Symmetry: D2
């Protein structure tokens, strides 16, 4: 399937590893030029070298930035536009206490100043550019940062509900400009954070990582943990010319967890 | 129907007028003692005098407080507990630019520091008290402050989605203590704010209030605007002993708007 | 709370036992005259005698009828009208797997039971209620005493259909003050539930106690609901007080929907 | 993007025209062999000749069949298996008011059409796909060219049922890599849509142009979708790339679901 992505410019946040990295790879495979970013300069350079070697014909800009910080986010967009003159695609992809009574005002304000305002801010920054182009795709990754999907995750639940509604509202307003915005909700995907979570959960309980993994597998109807490639495939489809009539929706990519 | 509310202590925020006032009246009718509050001392005194005269056998504490301010909210709960020794019921009931591109970081942070954190904070403050009692009811009024319900209302959409999810999470955690929490989503209810909105909309467009009202009536399947009594009836039911198996849900009270 | 039900005429199907019986009791307590029905004459007579002795001031009509059969359902309504001249309230409460096993005849038989049963009875009472400018229909949308689970395929399909039917009919009948809502029970202690525990335990090779323990850990309130708790909401929805509530489905489930 | 569809065998119902025809075309483009069907031999032959001439390297089996009839549906699958030995993909795409007017026979006839039609065909292909450890079923859940609206009561009930069926079957078949999803079209430019515009305009006493203008103002993208745009998503869901997506319903609607 021709996705119509040749020479499209894609900014993928959180692209030094895991889901974001594989999304960047797949976008490059379809002919996009890339902006990849993250806070960890060492990890980002490894990603950058891997992508440049795998896709020597494609342009790749790497930028160290904290996309939960206003100044870094503003400069990220300015540097991207300076390099490429356009930004066609934005993939928003960014990152303990679970008991309600224990969460203070500062705790909640702190959660809102992370991913929630982070995605809103970056969306706001790219919208004028995409509207000028009459072409944009924004895909919001609305998950739990490698934790087992569960209603117990209270902070992420609130933030993710807010972001799903924001997605609908912005989609409705930007649809007349062919700027489309959708969200994808991962199930259990085999990422570095997921693997780190297996280690952390195995200790709190007194067991092994393989044992915790087996318990997780029982909850997934497919009885298999998803790959980053499986997740990336949908994101790339949504970011394509082929998804030109799809906007304002949230899609679970989860091996049946939602059933 | 005996609602089992005799001598229960109910705190109703935003109770100087409109929905909150009628909820306070109906709770007093069922035998509750009240805490009523609001920022407007003059309006609150009028409410206080009306309730005291209508329900002379019931205790009524009135407190001037801004329930979007942390200190006022903390003191509200402390003063309530000092007066009554218990708080059985909390009704969370508190209050322009609509285009996404025009909304800054400060704008969004400001919206989150209002009703969103306001309801979360007050919930957090009453939970230890209600859990000690093994008896609590929290009803969150999740609406649009007298504006015509519409997907266009972007700020309230995000906040309300967040609050509906928060409701579910807190309900799940507090259910083992018989502390039940639910939300009610008003449709078009005849309140002071609604009537003020008719005036403001009639000017922006060049028409009358009755004309704007007629346009609103066409959107409501019942072809009638709801009364504050109709709204209050459900809130009082949810706050009662009779609703002892109902928690974590959101109920539209809207004359069919959701259909 | 005065529910405004004095002398209202209520038809409750499946009212010989369990949820339906308790709903009938509670409606009589609030001043309704009743029509009760069931397929088994002996069980229906027991219910009638209990209700007639408890509420001798109220009129109670008992009729043997299979409300999944067209002729019986039509005659039930005609007999009710001949007795009372009106029907104010209908509570639809009638009874109700490996996908590859389920044949066409199995699915068609499913649809010719509760699904068309509720639709047909709704159709039969609508003109009565519309001419009154007063009606309440409450659809009980449950699993008929089986513990809620994604595994119950037929009931899931039927119940999804009925929830949508509820919305559609509500929208059409709203201006006639004929209000239609559904209640989705969680786990409620009925004779049917108790029999299901026996059957499931026998099939699983375990004890009813162990099945009950498994169910309880899924419910945030950590207890099974009573028929009185369930009936309270149904009676509220059938009342004058619920005059602005229509087209909605309310889970009554101890928090199961937030688990 | 390589969709991994080379030599896969796809059955598309309702494939003589419109959405079904375009889906068949696009599946052939990605390397599938086809089974196409319809009730009208002349229209089916036209579709066959078009596809056979466009994709002469692919196998195309055309069969006259009424997929709302049990015998025809059973024979369709047997004939398909006799030709190809396997069926990898099924796209369920078959055709499909005042409440008080609608009789039992009307509702039963509704349920004996598309509802049991999709369920039956799913049941027929499941064992084929399960033994392969590879299957994709995509249910087209629309209004068959009528403009989406709460007024369409029968389709709403059937479609709600089918969306739930999708979830239930997905959960059961997931470990066999047999994935089942639904797509809900908004307004798509098909011959059926165009005929509906004519009929609705005639019934309303207005022009097709004015009906189209009314529809366009409901769609945030301010345009009606093409069959190619719709087919793109169906083909993606039918692909190897969608290997972790199951049990979900995706609106393909230009933002209508966020309007």
């Amino acid at each position: 399937m021709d996705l119509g992505l040749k020479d499209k410019v894609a900014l993928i946040t959180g692209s030094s590893a895991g889901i974001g990295f594989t999304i960047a790879e797949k976008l490059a495979e379809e002919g996009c030029h890339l902006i990849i970013c993250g806070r960890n300069s060492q990890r980002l350079e490894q990603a950058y070298q891997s992508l440049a070697q795998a896709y020597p014909a494609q342009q790749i800009l790497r930028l160290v930035a904290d996309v939960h910080q206003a100044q870094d986010s503003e400069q990220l967009i300015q540097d991207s536009l300076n390099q490429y003159g356009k930004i066609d695609i934005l993939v928003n992809n960014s990152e303990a206490e679970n008991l309600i009574e224990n969460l203070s005002d500062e705790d909640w304000l702190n959660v809102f100043q992370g991913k929630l305002i982070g995605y809103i801010r970056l969306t706001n920054l790219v919208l004028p550019i995409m509207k000028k182009q009459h072409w944009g795709r924004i895909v919001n990754i609305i998950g739990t940062s490698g934790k087992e999907p569960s209603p117990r995750l209270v902070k992420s639940g609130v933030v993710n509900a807010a972001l799903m509604n924001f997605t609908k509202s912005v989609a409705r307003q930007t649809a007349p400009y062919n700027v489309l915005i959708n969200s994808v909700n991962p199930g259990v995907i085999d990422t570095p954070r997921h693997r780190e979570y297996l280690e952390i959960y195995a200790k709190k309980e007194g067991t092994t990582p393989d044992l915790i993994r087996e318990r997780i597998l029982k909850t997934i109807p497919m009885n298999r943990i998803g790959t980053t490639e499986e997740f990336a495939n949908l994101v790339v489809f949504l970011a394509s010319e082929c998804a030109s009539y799809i906007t304002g929706i949230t899609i679970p990519l989860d091996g049946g967890l939602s059933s």
